[PDB]
Design a protein around this ligand. Sequence first.
Ligand SMILES: [Mg+2]
Ligand SMILES: [Mg+2]
Ligand SMILES: [Mg+2]
Ligand SMILES: [Mg+2]
Ligand SMILES: [Mg+2]
Ligand SMILES: [Mg+2]
Ligand SMILES: [Mg+2]
Ligand SMILES: [Mg+2]
Ligand SMILES: [Mg+2]
Ligand SMILES: [Mg+2]
Ligand SMILES: [Mg+2]
Ligand SMILES: [Mg+2]
Ligand SMILES: [Mg+2]
Ligand SMILES: [Mg+2]
Ligand SMILES: [Mg+2]
Ligand SMILES: [Mg+2]
Ligand SMILES: [Mg+2]
Ligand SMILES: [Mg+2]
Ligand SMILES: [Mg+2]
Ligand SMILES: [Mg+2]
Ligand SMILES: [Mg+2]
Ligand SMILES: [Mg+2]
Ligand SMILES: [Mg+2]
Ligand SMILES: [Mg+2]
Ligand SMILES: [Mg+2]
Ligand SMILES: [Mg+2]
Ligand SMILES: [Mg+2]
Ligand SMILES: [Mg+2]
Ligand SMILES: [Mg+2]
Ligand SMILES: [Mg+2]
Ligand SMILES: [Mg+2]
Ligand SMILES: [Mg+2]
Ligand SMILES: [Mg+2]
Ligand SMILES: [Mg+2]
Ligand SMILES: [Mg+2]
Ligand SMILES: [Mg+2]
Ligand SMILES: [Mg+2]
Ligand SMILES: [Mg+2]
Ligand SMILES: [Mg+2]
Ligand SMILES: [Mg+2]
Ligand SMILES: [Mg+2]
Ligand SMILES: [Mg+2]
Ligand SMILES: [Mg+2]
Ligand SMILES: [Mg+2]
Ligand SMILES: [Mg+2]
Ligand SMILES: [Zn+2]
Lengths: 75, 159, 104
Amino acid sequence: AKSKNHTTHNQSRKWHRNGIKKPRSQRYESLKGVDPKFLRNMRFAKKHNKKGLKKMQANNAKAMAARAEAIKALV
Amino acid sequence: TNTKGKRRGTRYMFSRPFRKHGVVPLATYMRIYKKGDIVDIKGMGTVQKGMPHKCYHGKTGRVYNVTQHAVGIVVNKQVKGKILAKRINVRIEHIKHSKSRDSFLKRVKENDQKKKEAKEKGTWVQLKRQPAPPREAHFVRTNGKEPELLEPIPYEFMA
Amino acid sequence: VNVPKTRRTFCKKCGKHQPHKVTQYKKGKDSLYAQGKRRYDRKQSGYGGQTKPIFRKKAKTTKKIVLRLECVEPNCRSKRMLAIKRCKHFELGGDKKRKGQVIQ
RNA sequence: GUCUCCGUAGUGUAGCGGUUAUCACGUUCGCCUAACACGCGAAAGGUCCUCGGUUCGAAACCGGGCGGAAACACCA
RNA sequence: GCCCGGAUAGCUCAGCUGUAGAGCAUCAGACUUUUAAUCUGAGGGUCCAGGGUUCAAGUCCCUGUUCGGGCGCCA
RNA sequence: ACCCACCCGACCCGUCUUGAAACACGGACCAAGGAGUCUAACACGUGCGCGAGUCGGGGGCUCGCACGAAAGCCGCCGUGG
RNA sequence: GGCCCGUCUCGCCCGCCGCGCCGGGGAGGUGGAGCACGAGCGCACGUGUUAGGACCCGAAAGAUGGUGAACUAUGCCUGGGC
RNA sequence: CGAAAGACUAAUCGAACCAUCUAGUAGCUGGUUCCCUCCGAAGUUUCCCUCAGGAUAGCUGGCGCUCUCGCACACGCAGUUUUAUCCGGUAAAGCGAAUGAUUAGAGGUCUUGGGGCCGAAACGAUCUCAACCUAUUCUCAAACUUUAAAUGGGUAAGAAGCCCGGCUCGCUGGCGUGAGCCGGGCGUGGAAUGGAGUGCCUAGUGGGCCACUUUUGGUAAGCAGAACUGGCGCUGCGGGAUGA
RNA sequence: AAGCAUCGCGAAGGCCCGCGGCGGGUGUUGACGCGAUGUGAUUUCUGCCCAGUGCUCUGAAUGUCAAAGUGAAGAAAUUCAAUGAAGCGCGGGUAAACGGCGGGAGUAACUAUGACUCUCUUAAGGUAGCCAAAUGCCUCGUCAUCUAAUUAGUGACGCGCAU
RNA sequence: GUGCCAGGUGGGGAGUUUGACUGGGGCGGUACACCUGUCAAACGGUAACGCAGGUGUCCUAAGGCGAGCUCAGGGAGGACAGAAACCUCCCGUGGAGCAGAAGGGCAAAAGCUCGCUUGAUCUUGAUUUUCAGUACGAAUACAGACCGUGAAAGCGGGGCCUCACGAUCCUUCUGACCUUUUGGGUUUUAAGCAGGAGGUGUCAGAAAAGUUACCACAGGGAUAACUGGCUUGUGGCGGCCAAGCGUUCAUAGCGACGUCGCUUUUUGAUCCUUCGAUGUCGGCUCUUCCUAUCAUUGUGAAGCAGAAUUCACCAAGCGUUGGAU
RNA sequence: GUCUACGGCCAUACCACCCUGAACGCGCCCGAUCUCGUCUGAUCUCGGAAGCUAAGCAGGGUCGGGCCUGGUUAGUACUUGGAUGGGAGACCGCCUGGGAAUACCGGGUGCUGUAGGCUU
RNA sequence: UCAAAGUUUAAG
Ligand SMILES: [Mg+2]
Ligand SMILES: [Mg+2]
Ligand SMILES: [Mg+2]
Ligand SMILES: [Mg+2]
Ligand SMILES: [Mg+2]
Ligand SMILES: [Mg+2]
Ligand SMILES: [Mg+2]
Ligand SMILES: [Mg+2]
Ligand SMILES: [Mg+2]
Ligand SMILES: [Mg+2]
Ligand SMILES: [Mg+2]
Ligand SMILES: [Mg+2]
Ligand SMILES: [Mg+2]
Ligand SMILES: [Mg+2]
Ligand SMILES: [Mg+2]
Ligand SMILES: [Mg+2]
Ligand SMILES: [Mg+2]
Ligand SMILES: [Mg+2]
Ligand SMILES: [Mg+2]
Ligand SMILES: [Mg+2]
Ligand SMILES: [Mg+2]
Ligand SMILES: [Mg+2]
Ligand SMILES: [Mg+2]
Ligand SMILES: [Mg+2]
Ligand SMILES: [Mg+2]
Ligand SMILES: [Mg+2]
Ligand SMILES: [Mg+2]
Ligand SMILES: [Mg+2]
Ligand SMILES: [Mg+2]
Ligand SMILES: [Mg+2]
Ligand SMILES: [Mg+2]
Ligand SMILES: [Mg+2]
Ligand SMILES: [Mg+2]
Ligand SMILES: [Mg+2]
Ligand SMILES: [Mg+2]
Ligand SMILES: [Mg+2]
Ligand SMILES: [Mg+2]
Ligand SMILES: [Mg+2]
Ligand SMILES: [Mg+2]
Ligand SMILES: [Mg+2]
Ligand SMILES: [Mg+2]
Ligand SMILES: [Mg+2]
Ligand SMILES: [Mg+2]
Ligand SMILES: [Mg+2]
Ligand SMILES: [Mg+2]
Ligand SMILES: [Zn+2]
């Protein structure tokens, strides 16, 4: 009682009933499987972003004032 | 039934082309892959450490990791019904920059040039591409000489 | 195969590399008062015949050899199991084979 | 056809990868005998079935050739 | 796996920590007209392998490799 | 809707089967009977009550139970889950 | 990004009735059916999956306890027949 | 019990009958009860003392939810194509290119031979056949190939994008990198089509067969076995007299 | 089935029943008996093989071999030791126990066969007989006979797939 | 002797088992776990008891570095020395070698020869390959230790790459001033925790021999033994071509080397139909049909004088017997 | 014009033979005390500067081989999709689109980056 | 106070 051994006959049709959907690309993918020494470092970089905030805020305020002076000169 | 061996059926794939065996020329090794660089994998027989699997030969993908002398690279692989974005670590020698993207970057750069200019002018320019249209009305001048008559030629058996 | 009787390799307890004494491993005697054996004996007791299975279908013809790496530096002497691939010949320190010589 | 084994001086056989290839008979040459036989003393003789391989090295280990010989070929 | 034999010169076997025994076989001397048979001598042991104990080991010790009779069998 | 005529169409159902009108099996005919149930355990869905709670059992107090072996209540209201 | 529990690596300080092979923390990885202003409990209905006779009908068997030698098998007792 | 046939033991014997355990177990036969409406499969996956069965994926249904806007004011997705750009070693072709096969003559004491004929013998003369070589020549290859298609497989075609300004790092470093953060500045970025996304429960199925083209075994087969698509199976209707 | 031939047993026995008993059957028996096998009247014979598998005989001369008992160290559970029954092994017997019972070469003044000789081999190598039988594949064997004609029958032959 | 333990012996008796695939089964194979090339239709993926082969190992270096070299083969030379010993020059894209099958890869190497070595060590995760996108095995990139080597850049956590391997349970060994060993404490013991090893080749892993003709049950046309279908290799019958035979002359009658057909009175293939059964060989009896014609009717041919004859045409009307085994 | 050092792409750069090379370079070259290493100062290492372009190296040459690039081969071979097209089959023709490879014949025969010379 | 030792033109 020998059988049919293998096939792929109806399979393509089966696959395409529900698409063959491309893998859902999100923005912001994970950092799983990234070279550890990188991740250590970038973690540390994130950890101390809050240090040197006041300087950054002051710089942004100076930039905004320069923009306002430029728009007043234009108008 | 077939063997599941890793390198089965890569007699021709991983085989350096005719009169290009030997030393791997160094440019290969000394060009930089950042994150998010689109990259087309293509196995190479010489360098056997860090070879990608035969399925990803030909496939292109983006870089997500950069170790010392290898580069993690997300590629799409189909599997019967479902496509799986999956991440492989290939040693540099089996990898090139995919020029696919560069023609697009050139076109964006051209649009930005043509958007900065032609704004102060006022004349808005065609930015989108457009498919090769029907080839327009035009005259053909049979200058003096008439067209050449072409009889089909009579059969004869050569061999 | 041949392996040498000394081996400068890692010693967990010290932390460094260090010379170890090598020797091939063997099974110990089988307690009699391990939980298993005790469990088997008082199952196997009474009537019923044999209760657990008996393996009568040997396939392979060799064991994975295991070295027992003992650290040489005293105030340590930390032993350690170190497996090697299968082989139906093994020895320790059986000469150095000699390149470029006469065979007779 | 399957699986198995064996092909070694003229004959029948030994042979554990490194041999002058073992033993017996046969053969030739002496002697002994009137001669012969027996007997005694010497000698000569192997394509190790065939080809290719592995091996530093194959008569053997491995593959195929040409031969030879056992067992199986059942239920209708 | 557990107990124990044996491994000694071509062969079969003795050997009580201080030229390795016997017999056969091997090769030169007698005997033979010669041969065989038999008598005399000679040559020939990695004492299975390695380490130790020991002043000294063929033996004691341990450990292997065998090699056989019995026991034995939970991935 | 009863009968009859004519033209056209039209093979016997059930079933296993890649394939049944089958030279595959079951079936003369009619009546009545005749096969996805209940319990427990889980899961997800849905509806209702209450909500950091929720809960009801088991027990107890209220009746001779006509309807009740219900209904109601309980610092037991929470031992406990 | 953070926190908890396991686990490793590295490190420097604290605590006291009992100063100790005592106790407590830190930084960085990594395992967890975790936390990160709660969603459960009870009841009812449905579907599915099981355990039960378990959709219905179906063996050849297996076990326990009993009834039979009025047939037939063989022995014995006592009669009959050729 | 047997003068032995597995004979006989109440029409029952290679283990009697009766009742119970018992509704014994069955991956196997058979059957399985009203109507309409909507959706609608599979015979392939890996694992299995698995191959008449299960498991797991797939294909189905059901329940939904989150958004979208024909309410003059759309984003994303596709069994297409286009424009870029990679991949390929099949058809073909080739063998005066490698590998292997293979015909013929021209040329060559290459080598050397074995056989000759004329030579004592002599690369002497003359032939010859061996292998080798110098140009040529005949025909070949699923497990050869310098070449090399058609059809085919990836990517890409923008707001998650560009372009400025500045901060963080224990990484990296002559200075710089590279990454990560804040803060502003800029909009339709090929064709054609269409509303998308997402999560739970989930049955049946896991004997398939047929045709175009490709294709392996076989002399072949209404044979066995794969690929691709479409069928039949689940499906009537016109035609092919008849008919999956 | 008679006849033949083996085997066990002298009774606290052989053989056998039974769940058990100072139980029972043979047995109201005693080797001219009871029990267990084979062969199958008479006649005439009954070859060789004890290597294999069985059965049996002997047993400190002795490898292993259990529980108990004996010693040992240990705080004790314990472990280690020596000790050591039958049975295996070791050594005899047994085939009217199960059974088994050969292969090359060369050789005789025509050829042919081969008395004869050479080997290689087993535990022996199929003896007496008997045969294409109820046993022989090839096979409708060959020769004779029986028939006009015989894959049949009988008598011979023997090389006998596989007496 | 009885009672209770121990070892032996025990198809007298009991219970049970006696794989799978498979052009029916059995026998044979292993296509049952792996790997190369092909099949395979130029991504990947793909079947058969398709083809050609390999695997259950091997290596203290044949692993790791660094240095230096250059291999196969050939030519021309040189005492003994010849086709082969050793030395020397030249050519040499690899035609060698790299443990093994095959494919790829490899030349101031991945080959050979030296020098020093243990990266074949200790430890987290990520990924790839089979994939269900679970395991195992095998691999890839990192990261943290401790080392090796090199002047150094670097390279190295086994073998240039593609195969060489194994769960739960149990056992054993190793590891930490570790946990538990339960009313508390000390010590043995045992149990845990984490990593090796002892194996399941039917290789995701039962512990397992026969027979049944005395047989039984559930099923199966998923599967054999008939017929009938397809097929026609094989069997049978028939052409074409014409080298030959036929004293002579290819073809009266034949016909090699080749080639094209038909037939289903052979046998194979095959497995569609039937396993809730289509009565399984022959003979006898009886009818009918076919022609590929033995005889008979009518004819063409001859190597037909006659007689006898073969060869061919129309043709199946009528016949085609009695016996021995 | 050109070279040296380190190079990128790796024959338009290779191979064979022939010719020519100012200056600086590159070399050959001459030595072995030290360093270093050899059977051997041949190579390797080191100290030099008397010769010379002979050789390497560069540039050129050859109706050169090779390689690179066009044509031709050829709209041929092959091929996507199509037909109740043909043909007994084997196979072939058409439609719809895509389209190769030898032989044969031409042309070409290194480009170029960084740093430093020379031709002042 | 007993090892083994077989054979001999047809050619007068
Ligand atoms: Mg199937
Ligand atoms: Mg017991
Ligand atoms: Mg029907
Ligand atoms: Mg029919
Ligand atoms: Mg039926
Ligand atoms: Mg009926
Ligand atoms: Mg009813
Ligand atoms: Mg609910
Ligand atoms: Mg469920
Ligand atoms: Mg149920
Ligand atoms: Mg029943
Ligand atoms: Mg039973
Ligand atoms: Mg019988
Ligand atoms: Mg029922
Ligand atoms: Mg089944
Ligand atoms: Mg069925
Ligand atoms: Mg291919
Ligand atoms: Mg071709
Ligand atoms: Mg079929
Ligand atoms: Mg169906
Ligand atoms: Mg007898
Ligand atoms: Mg006898
Ligand atoms: Mg005996
Ligand atoms: Mg006889
Ligand atoms: Mg008769
Ligand atoms: Mg007779
Ligand atoms: Mg039994
Ligand atoms: Mg089967
Ligand atoms: Mg394809
Ligand atoms: Mg090197
Ligand atoms: Mg490291
Ligand atoms: Mg190596
Ligand atoms: Mg206590
Ligand atoms: Mg019988
Ligand atoms: Mg039978
Ligand atoms: Mg039946
Ligand atoms: Mg059938
Ligand atoms: Mg038939
Ligand atoms: Mg003629
Ligand atoms: Mg009938
Ligand atoms: Mg006719
Ligand atoms: Mg010099
Ligand atoms: Mg020069
Ligand atoms: Mg010159
Ligand atoms: Mg040229
Ligand atoms: Zn240590």
